[PDB]
Amino acid sequence: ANNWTDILAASDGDEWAAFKTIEAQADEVRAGHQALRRAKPLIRLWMNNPDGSEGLVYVGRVDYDDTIRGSFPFKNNTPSQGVLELRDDNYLAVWLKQLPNNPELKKNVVITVDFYGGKKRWSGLLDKWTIKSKEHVKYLEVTFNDDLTMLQYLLCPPNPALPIPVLQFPRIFGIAGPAKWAISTLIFINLFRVQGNLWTLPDDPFNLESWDDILDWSDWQCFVKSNSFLLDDSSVWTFLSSRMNPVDSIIADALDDAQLTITYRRVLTDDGETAEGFPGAHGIKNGALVFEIVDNSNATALEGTFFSGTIVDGFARSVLLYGGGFVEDTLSVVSDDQTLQPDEYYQSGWLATMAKMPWLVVRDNEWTPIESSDLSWGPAKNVSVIVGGDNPAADAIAKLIIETTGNLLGYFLLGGFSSAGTIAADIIMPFLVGTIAAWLQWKNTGRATELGWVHYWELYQQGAETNSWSLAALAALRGGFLVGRSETVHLMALHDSWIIPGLHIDIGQRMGSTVNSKGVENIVWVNQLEEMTAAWDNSAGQTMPLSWVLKAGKSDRAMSIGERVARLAKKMSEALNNVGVHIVQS
Amino acid sequence: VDNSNATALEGTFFSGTIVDGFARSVLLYGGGFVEDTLSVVSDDQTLQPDEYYQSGWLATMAKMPWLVVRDNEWTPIESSDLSWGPAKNVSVIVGGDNPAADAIAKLIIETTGNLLGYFLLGGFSSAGTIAADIIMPFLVGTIAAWLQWKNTGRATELGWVHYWELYQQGAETNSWSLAALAALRGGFLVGRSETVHLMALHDSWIIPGLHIDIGQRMGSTVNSKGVENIVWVNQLEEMTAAWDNSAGQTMPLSWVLKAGKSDRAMSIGERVARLAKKMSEALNNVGVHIVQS
Amino acid sequence: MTMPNGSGGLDPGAWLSHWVNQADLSSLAGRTEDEVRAYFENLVQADSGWGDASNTFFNLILG
């Protein structure tokens, strides 16, 4: 804390000298920021232990200058593919090529790309490699899948705590609780099951006093860290249901509705990194993956967050207000905003964006450090949603057999079939399957008010789990209304802007952006960051330095046709699996 | 026809080197026959086919693959894409409902008979009577409804870090109970190690269809450092004969081979088309297996 | 798929509402054949139409 008087005294009463001192300090801080922004990435390949033990084993390092090209995207709750092109004379390229036919090696490889000294990390398993010939010149194009693909291969059986081919009761597994706790708990229960179900599950997995200290978790390749059921600060709850559904498909709707983010970190204990906050966090091996559900948007918080703003008065704080039945949520602006700044904003060397106080607004004008590719807005579509089908609470097959045959036998013993005088008691239940309270229709009053006289009427929505709406009516309706809403998406390319992706702003964290277009110069579009790709090309023909491209917000409308088809195909395949497993045998 | 001859008693060639030729291996099935590994024949004494001693013969016999397509500085072919990917999922789950336990005929007749017997004994008059399976409709889809298999060979290949499991739906949705082993092997057909090689035979001496036919095993090499000696042995999967007589661009009749298949290196359009085909067939099957209300 | 209210977002009258886990995950290992069988046998014994039929058969028809 060098005061102005102290600086002036050090400069011997010369105001110009003192201000030059201050300017030099500011210049050195700016230079440090620029060096951090322009630092080269650290690409390292690791392998499984050939003897079959735990802990990833260091294979080698690829130099950024020795790459041909690279592309690594970070996406919000979505798996992404990283691409790295090498010359075939490169030693790691040779190692990868010899890997398939090397009998002394395990076939799985992990890439870790570190930006800003490991603060930002892209880690993923090898997907494949290809030997490609450009004009008789051969190069190895290596494709990795980011570490969020493990949630596709993790699936939740109806009873994750019992053997699967023996008895899986009930028909579907349903867990309800605070959103972050329930998502993390589902993931942890499936991790426990797939690691072997060796020990007994306590009531709350994340109540660390319930787990014995003698237990060894070092063989686990994946961990989940979360707070306990009582200590979880998630304002909203969630109901997750599964019948052998993949975990990511189970949790996608809840993550979207609560605006939560899945963060994965591969703890390289060879680099000195440690982990804490989950069972067995002290004995984890090198390269073990850790998952954490975070609230980077802070939209559901009590104090709210920034949903809009203008370039002349900054952001505007709004809080969610829920209407009748909590299906509908609107925004009420905080007229007298008195939220305190985070304590992190008063710490030297801090650069991140706190969820409660977003700060990053990226302005586009005649002199702009970024380029804005496209900003697209689209209104909401359907005022009402219908979700349903059959209601098992009324016409389950067990009821249809037992209760109806008992009622028929009672009617028969009273003599109803001998003469019609007797009054029956529900002997026609099998005739009304799928008709009694089989649907839920909700009209979004806020959406209708926003849309007006001419609007699309209704949409039928089938959930990820086909027979869970009766368990959670409200969750089903909110998941249905997740589909046809107002959508804004903005594409930015940060060429030499002072913004440092990962450091200044992270995935899932709200930021504002402007577009230099007449009529919306003042407006700031506030979206939670959804994608950021770091790409480079070292080719002689076209040479692109390592550059970041951001995509803030998401929109099904402006999504490309190929991506739309792929997403639809994935959802259709998952729904087909769910229906096929819900088929009743003849 | 069996052109790969992989399941034969004498085995076939699954690998090789440009300095030692091909290596003979035979399939060895583990416990339950779900998993098959390769065991090399150290003393290979398989006799040559009689067709190899006949004048004018050019074809490849299944038991004795011979054709290795070599790529080097003076290669007669043009290699385009040699891609390898490792196996993905260690374990597979295939199941749903097991009709042998909760078929609708059972749920109606047997449960009605058991309930009638319990009623006549007086179970509903007083809880003293011991029942005999009057709760079967309550446990539909829960008794022995799944088959889970962990591929130990795949786990050994992959190592400490691997994808865990995958649910697989068969072509016929109600047949795993009829053939558990076949269903498990069909499920394990999906996420396996894949190698695919693309070659263009411009003026090479190789005669597609005559020297090598579709489905027959051939070896190929790529002139890339670290893998010159290796010979990737795959059964031929595609060969296209194409020509263009246009004055602007003119190409004579040329053949392009694709040996081995891979879902990973397939184009996105072809992947979407195949997935749409499988989804349409499965939707037809589910719709036809629907039970009327 | 989020419930803005607490546990009140669930439906107590649903078919499988008794089997939705909130924080009692130690009960998952207790869903074996015997316990589920006992629970459902208790429900079937408590079934009302069959009990009324039993009353009619054993008291009215059989004296």
Side-chain angles (χ1 to χ4, degrees), chain A residues 348-550:
Chain A
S348 173
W350 188 268
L351 295 167
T353 288
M354 290 318 271
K356 76 182 292 214
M357 196 75 56
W359 69 279
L360 189 48
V361 55
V362 181
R363 314 191 303 104
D364 172 31
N365 44 306
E366 177 172 354
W367 315 267
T368 177
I370 69 166
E371 73 93 22
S372 58
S373 179
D374 50 343
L375 189 141
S376 75
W377 172 84
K381 311 275 255 183
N382 66 310
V383 167
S384 44
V385 76
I386 297 175
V387 63
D390 212 345
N391 187 28
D395 46 30
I397 197 70
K399 192 164 309 191
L400 290 179
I401 294 176
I402 303 181
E403 298 197 7
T404 70
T405 196
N407 294 330
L408 279 160
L409 194 62
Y411 193 60
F412 158 87
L413 296 170
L414 282 177
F417 299 100
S418 184
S419 64
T422 302
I423 300 298
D426 197 11
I427 62 175
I428 66 168
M429 202 202 298
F431 279 113
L432 319 173
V433 181
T435 65
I436 310 292
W439 321 90
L440 289 170
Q441 180 189 13
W442 194 272
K443 162 178 298 176
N444 206 326
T445 72
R447 210 175 269 195
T449 308
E450 271 280 294
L451 282 184
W453 177 56
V454 176
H455 62 86
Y456 301 127
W457 296 285
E458 57 206 359
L459 214 62
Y460 174 79
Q461 281 308 302
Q462 190 194 34
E465 181 63 34
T466 307
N467 309 312
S468 65
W469 62 276
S470 54
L471 290 168
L474 171 53
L477 284 169
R478 291 197 62 113
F481 274 129
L482 275 180
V483 180
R485 45 187 177 169
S486 172
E487 286 159 4
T488 309
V489 64
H490 192 183
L491 270 296
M492 284 76 74
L494 320 168
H495 291 295
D496 212 20
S497 179
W498 53 269
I499 309 157
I500 312 171
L503 290 201
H504 277 143
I505 190 71
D506 207 14
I507 301 299
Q509 272 182 341
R510 289 189 172 275
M511 53 152 283
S513 47
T514 77
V515 65
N516 198 46
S517 179
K518 292 196 187 63
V520 291
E521 289 108 350
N522 200 35
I523 298 298
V524 166
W525 317 83
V526 179
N527 288 302
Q528 64 176 350
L529 191 63
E530 300 284 349
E531 293 184 359
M532 55 177 165
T533 305
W536 76 86
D537 195 359
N538 288 324
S539 57
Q542 73 290 349
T543 307
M544 170 183 71
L546 188 153
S547 60
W548 291 82
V549 163
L550 319 181

Side-chain angles (χ1 to χ4, degrees), chain A residues 585-586, chain B residues 93-103 106 143-148 167-184 289:
Chain A
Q585 288 310 309
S586 304
Chain B
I93 297 180
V94 55
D97 201 2
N98 187 28
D102 54 5
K106 200 160 306 193
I143 313 288
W146 320 92
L147 295 168
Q148 186 193 17
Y167 173 77
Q168 276 307 300
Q169 205 189 24
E172 178 59 37
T173 62
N174 294 353
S175 63
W176 61 275
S177 52
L178 284 165
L181 166 57
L184 284 170
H289 279 293

Side-chain angles (χ1 to χ4, degrees), chain A residues 48 53-56 88-89 94 97-101 105-108 110 125-133 138 145 149-155 158 164-171 191 193-195 218-222 243-244 266 285-288 397-398 401-402 405 409 413 430 433 565 569 572-573 576-577 579-581 583-586, chain B residues 71 78-89 93 95-99 102-105 107-108 111-112 115-116 119 134-135 137-148 150 155-167 169 173-174 222-227 230 232 264-265 272 275 278-280 282-283 286 289-291 293:
Chain A
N48 284 307
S53 58
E54 310 95 17
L56 297 181
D88 291 331
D89 194 20
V94 170
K97 272 175 286 167
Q98 300 166 344
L99 170 76
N101 309 110
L105 297 183
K106 305 296 195 187
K107 300 314 159 191
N108 263 341
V110 168
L125 271 176
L126 177 63
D127 173 51
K128 56 152 178 171
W129 52 253
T130 294
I131 305 180
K132 274 161 179 166
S133 300
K138 290 182 183 292
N145 280 1
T149 65
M150 316 281 288
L151 297 185
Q152 304 185 335
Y153 298 81
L154 199 68
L155 58 83
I164 279 178
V166 179
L167 162 72
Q168 284 291 293
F169 183 86
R171 184 164 204 89
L191 289 190
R193 175 196 52 94
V194 71
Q195 295 291 339
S218 61
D219 48 348
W220 284 41
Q221 62 163 351
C222 288
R243 185 161 172 79
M244 292 280 175
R266 211 161 260 275
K285 297 290 182 51
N286 187 75
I397 197 70
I401 294 176
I402 303 181
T405 196
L409 194 62
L413 296 170
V433 181
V565 163
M572 271 189 311
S573 188
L576 195 49
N577 287 345
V579 166
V581 69
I583 295 312
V584 162
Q585 288 310 309
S586 304
Chain B
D71 173 27
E78 185 255 339
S79 307
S80 160
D81 170 1
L82 195 144
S83 84
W84 169 88
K88 294 283 210 165
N89 60 310
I93 297 180
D97 201 2
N98 187 28
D102 54 5
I104 194 76
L107 297 173
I108 296 175
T111 71
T112 314
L115 275 159
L116 190 62
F119 157 89
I134 59 178
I135 71 161
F138 275 111
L139 310 168
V140 169
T142 68
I143 313 288
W146 320 92
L147 295 168
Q148 186 193 17
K150 163 177 298 178
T156 300
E157 293 157 17
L158 294 181
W160 183 53
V161 165
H162 57 84
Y163 300 137
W164 296 283
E165 55 197 358
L166 205 68
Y167 173 77
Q169 205 189 24
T173 62
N174 294 353
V222 63
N223 205 46
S224 188
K225 286 193 191 55
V227 292
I230 298 307
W232 316 78
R264 286 184 276 271
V272 167
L275 178 83
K278 278 174 291 197
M279 279 194 293
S280 193
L283 194 47
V286 164
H289 279 293
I290 299 307
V291 165
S293 303

Side-chain angles (χ1 to χ4, degrees), chain C residues 7-60:
Chain C
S7 47
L10 299 169
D11 308 76
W15 187 238
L16 296 182
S17 78
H18 180 279
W19 310 101
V20 175
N21 304 98
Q22 285 199 8
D24 44 3
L25 283 186
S26 74
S27 68
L28 271 171
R31 306 181 169 171
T32 71
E33 190 83 25
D34 308 64
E35 321 295 328
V36 177
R37 205 153 283 275
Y39 176 89
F40 282 145
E41 281 162 356
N42 202 34
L43 292 176
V44 175
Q45 159 79 41
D47 193 273
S48 77
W50 273 101
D52 294 310
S54 177
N55 288 343
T56 302
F57 181 69
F58 291 115
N59 298 310
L60 164 71

